Amino acid sequence: MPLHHLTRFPRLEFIGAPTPLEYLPRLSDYLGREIYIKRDDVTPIAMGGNKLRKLEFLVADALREGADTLITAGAIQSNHVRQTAAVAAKLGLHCVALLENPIGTTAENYLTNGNRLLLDLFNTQIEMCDALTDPDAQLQTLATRIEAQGFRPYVIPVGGSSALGAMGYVESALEIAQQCEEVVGLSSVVVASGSAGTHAGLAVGLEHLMPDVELIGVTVSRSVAEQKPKVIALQQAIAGQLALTATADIHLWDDYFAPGYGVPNDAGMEAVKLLASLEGVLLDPVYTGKAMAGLIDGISQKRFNDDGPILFIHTGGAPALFAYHPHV
Amino acid sequence: MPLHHLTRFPRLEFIGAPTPLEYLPRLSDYLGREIYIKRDDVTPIAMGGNKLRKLEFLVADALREGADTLITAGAIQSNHVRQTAAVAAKLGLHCVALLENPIGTTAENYLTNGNRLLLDLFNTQIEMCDALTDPDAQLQTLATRIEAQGFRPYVIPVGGSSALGAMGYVESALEIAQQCEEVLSSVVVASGSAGTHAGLAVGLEHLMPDVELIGVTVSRSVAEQKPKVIALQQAIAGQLALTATADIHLWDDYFAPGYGVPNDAGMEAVKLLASLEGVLLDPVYTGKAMAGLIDGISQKRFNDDGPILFIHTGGAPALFAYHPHV
Numbered sequence A: 001m002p003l004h005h006l007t008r009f010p011r012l013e014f015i016g017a018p019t020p021l022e023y024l025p026r027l028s029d030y031l032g033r034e035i036y037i038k039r040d041d042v043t044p045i046a047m048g049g050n051k052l053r054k055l056e057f058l059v060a061d062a063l064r065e066g067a068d069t070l071i072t073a074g075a076i077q078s079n080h081v082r083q084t085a086a087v088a089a090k091l092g093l094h095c096v097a098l099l100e101n102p103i104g105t106t107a108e109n110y111l112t113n114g115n116r117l118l119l120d121l122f123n124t125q126i127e128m129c130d131a132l133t134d135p136d137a138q139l140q141t142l143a144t145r146i147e148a149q150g151f152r153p154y155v156i157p158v159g160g161s162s163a164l165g166a167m168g169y170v171e172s173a174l175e176i177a178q179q180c181e182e183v184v185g186l187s188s189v190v191v192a193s194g195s196a197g198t199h200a201g202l203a204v205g206l207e208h209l210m211p212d213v214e215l216i217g218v219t220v221s222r223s224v225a226e227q228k229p230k231v232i233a234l235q236q237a238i239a240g241q242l243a244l245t246a247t248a249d250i251h252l253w254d255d256y257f258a259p260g261y262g263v264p265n266d267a268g269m270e271a272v273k274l275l276a277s278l279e280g281v282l283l284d285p286v287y288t289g290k291a292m293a294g295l296i297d298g299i300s301q302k303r304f305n306d307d308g309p310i311l312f313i314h315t316g317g318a319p320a321l322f323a324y325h326p327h328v
Numbered sequence B: 001m002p003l004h005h006l007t008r009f010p011r012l013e014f015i016g017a018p019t020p021l022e023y024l025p026r027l028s029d030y031l032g033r034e035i036y037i038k039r040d041d042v043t044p045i046a047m048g049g050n051k052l053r054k055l056e057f058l059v060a061d062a063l064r065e066g067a068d069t070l071i072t073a074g075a076i077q078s079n080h081v082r083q084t085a086a087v088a089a090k091l092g093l094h095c096v097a098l099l100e101n102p103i104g105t106t107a108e109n110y111l112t113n114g115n116r117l118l119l120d121l122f123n124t125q126i127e128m129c130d131a132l133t134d135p136d137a138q139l140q141t142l143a144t145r146i147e148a149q150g151f152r153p154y155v156i157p158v159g160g161s162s163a164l165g166a167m168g169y170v171e172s173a174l175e176i177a178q179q180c181e182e183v184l185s186s187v188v189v190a191s192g193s194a195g196t197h198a199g200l201a202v203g204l205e206h207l208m209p210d211v212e213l214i215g216v217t218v219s220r221s222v223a224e225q226k227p228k229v230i231a232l233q234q235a236i237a238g239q240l241a242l243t244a245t246a247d248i249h250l251w252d253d254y255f256a257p258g259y260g261v262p263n264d265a266g267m268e269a270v271k272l273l274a275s276l277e278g279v280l281l282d283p284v285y286t287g288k289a290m291a292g293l294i295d296g297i298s299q300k301r302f303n304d305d306g307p308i309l310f311i312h313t314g315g316a317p318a319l320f321a322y323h324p325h326v
């Protein structure tokens, strides 16, 4: 009932049915407590991911206003850009991608394999830049150039993280609540926290549907101090758009992303190897590997509010495995 | 139900809900033909694919025999080996893979990226062989060796293609029949180790007898492939207490110069589906099968001009192994 103003926003159907919520018996056995996983990595469009939930709302908005071109930005190995380009192809929309190399790698698989390979298959127009120092401004400059060609552009921010995009994860929280109902008494939820839309959406949804559940964001690019205001801003904007209040404190752990965004670390790699070998589940070196390392250490250090079941949100990212191999 | 004997087989749930069956409006508009797609590339385990449907029955059997190890075989970039290894990891079973390099490549991505990379993640024990000249025999030798080493192995044949494995594609046919009540003249599928083709053959005979099932070969001529598909067709039907009289249809014009080697038509089919529908095919299987489908249109090769259903059997992780070239 409380999230009913969600039905107001037009949305396209890219996912279909609720994604699986699975128990992880072998990981749970190893970690010494109940771990469940929300399989948002399993969606039907071009290798899946959390970004698709946001695109359901963003692209419906684009269509509503008569846009014929989607413009967005990210790393060369961005999952969002790949999912945006896939959706654009599907719908016969043009797509323009402003890409940066965030880690200064010259490794050929990072440069041309994985997500970047898929972009070419989707006929994405590629605009390279030195760095995304001011993505919102840089995207508008690009959109102006594109508009001059007679295209009707729709700008999608980095990671699809606007209040509207984040509605996708308010929706995901509904699924989670219904899937857990009479099945599992959840204590904590863990999600990677990057451009912040996923975290913020879940934060609003879970505050209203499962208020006693502790939502933990594991940062992938920023410290708590830098990240927290971004998550809060979105949380409040989302709540406002839904005619709701959001009084919950945002929780973030920033210990698991060093030496920085898009750079693999040992604990991340070990988390990837653990999920693959114990559960046959594929994580990624940029996002989910790092988020899972956070979950594991949180259990190790008793960081969670209590000992109860933890739900891991699998936000996707596996195609990056092929870009990061063998190194850099 | 005429297919009642299917529930008599022990099966693990690896997939759950039926996979999507989708209309492809943009491809359809471009080809001037109604095209639908069975999304068996969207299965929840380790980047998905058709092999998982087979493994539901094969691995259930493995556990019934009390096995602790799964042993199978394929190319370095085998989708089947990758899905078997993921399933073994999930269930806490050892996995031993007998791998060959079918194309003589030394390309790094073929040798170490894509499906092969995932094998390492799943802690697969890898055994390289010069050639899978007699896979069934070579797998048995390995199994006896492993059993002598103090394990309880279960052998899964190449591509998971046994009568039991092929039950997974009788199951897919039931989904197709259910989902097509809103729609069909033809079905197109890649025909390799033959379990998918044969399973669909038996299912579709009983569920949608007016539909023409076309197998596009990915490794063999019609002469070499037809007896393999018929034999499995007959074995499946026998075990389900059914008769299978339907002819097997095969097109072999679309796989040159051989298994696991991309060709231009195949890669162009990949580009077409990606750019028109946001759908990812693969260089080894689905790209070639789709190339066949498209040529079937332009050569008026189907029995009539009506809607076509393409079976997406998966394979997309191989894109990353075949890039930039082999």
Ligand SMILES: [Cl-]
Residues within 6 Å of the ligand: A029, A030, A031, A032
């Ligand atoms: Cl332990």
